């Protein structure tokens, strides 16, 4: 009674037969903002099922020489659904998340992925290599949407911080002998009770193969990874025209 899970939120439902468990981030469940903590006087709209539901972004292919990918939140859902219109039409935003990563393979494949949630994953540059240039990353690479961006130097996570110590944040491991899902439930993390979804990204989702995928030819060489994510306890406030960026 642990390797099976049914995540039901809204009009969506994910079944799993080869789960590990559910991680709840920093031991806090997602919630709404108190009256003590709030400052804005406007009454926020709390749409409970039209945005709190599972969305499915795109697929990335785990090849042999794959290095890793990251997805910035909530940039993934600003052009997608009733969530991504309210985020455009409003100035503020506050939601938790339930991330779900799927990678199914046989009992003759092997490999491991680290699926980590790093708050405030600020991106660095190679400084031209020499270290002389104070270069900055482009908007394509800082906020890449739902198609994600691949890491060039995954040992340092493209920020100068090591992959080894990333298990101090939230994480699960997708070991193809043991599991094919990873469920992480994230609360809202910010110094502020509310912030804008289009300028500030609250956290990043790292997917890194620590162990390389291996199979003997004859098997299926195409092993996708699909990110599936639900907002939770979402709140919006400050209504004006729709702006994309």
């Amino acid at each position: 009674s642990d390797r099976v899970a049914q995540l039901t939120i809204g009009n969506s439902t994910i079944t799993t037969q080869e789960a590990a468990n559910i991680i709840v981030g920093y031991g806090e469940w997602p919630s709404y903002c108190s009256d003590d903590d709030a400052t804005a006087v406007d009454k926020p709209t709390r749409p409970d099922v039209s945005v709190n539901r599972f969305y499915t972004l795109d697929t990335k292919l785990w090849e042999k020489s794959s290095k890793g990918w990251y997805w910035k939140f909530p940039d993934v859902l600003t052009e997608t659904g009733v969530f991504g219109q309210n985020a455009q039409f409003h100035y503020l935003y506050r939601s938790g998340f339930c991330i779900h990563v799927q990678c199914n393979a046989s009992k003759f494949h092997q490999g491991a992925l680290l699926v980590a949630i790093l708050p405030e994953y600020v991106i660095g540059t190679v400084a031209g290599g020499t270290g002389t240039e104070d270069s900055h990353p482009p908007y394509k690479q800082t906020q890449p949407g739902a198609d994600g961006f691949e890491l060039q130097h995954p040992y340092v996570l493209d920020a100068g911080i090591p992959i080894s110590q990333l298990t101090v944040c939230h994480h699960q491991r997708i070991n193809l002998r043991t599991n094919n899902c990873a469920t992480i439930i994230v609360p809202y993390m910010n110094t502020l009770p509310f912030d804008s979804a289009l300028n500030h990204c609250n956290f990043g989702l790292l997917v890194v193969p620590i162990s390389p995928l291996d199979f003997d030819q004859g098997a299926t060489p195409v092993i996708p990874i699909t990110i599936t994510l639900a907002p939770m306890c979402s709140e919006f406030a400050g209504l004006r025209q729709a702006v994309t960026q």
């Binding site: 009674s1 899970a5 049914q6 809204g10 789960a19």
Partner: peptide
């Protein structure tokens, strides 16, 4: 309501 639990799978 929403359920986000393990063990119980009424769809399978």
């Amino acid at each position: 309501s929403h359920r986000l639990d393990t063990g119980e799978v009424p769809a399978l």
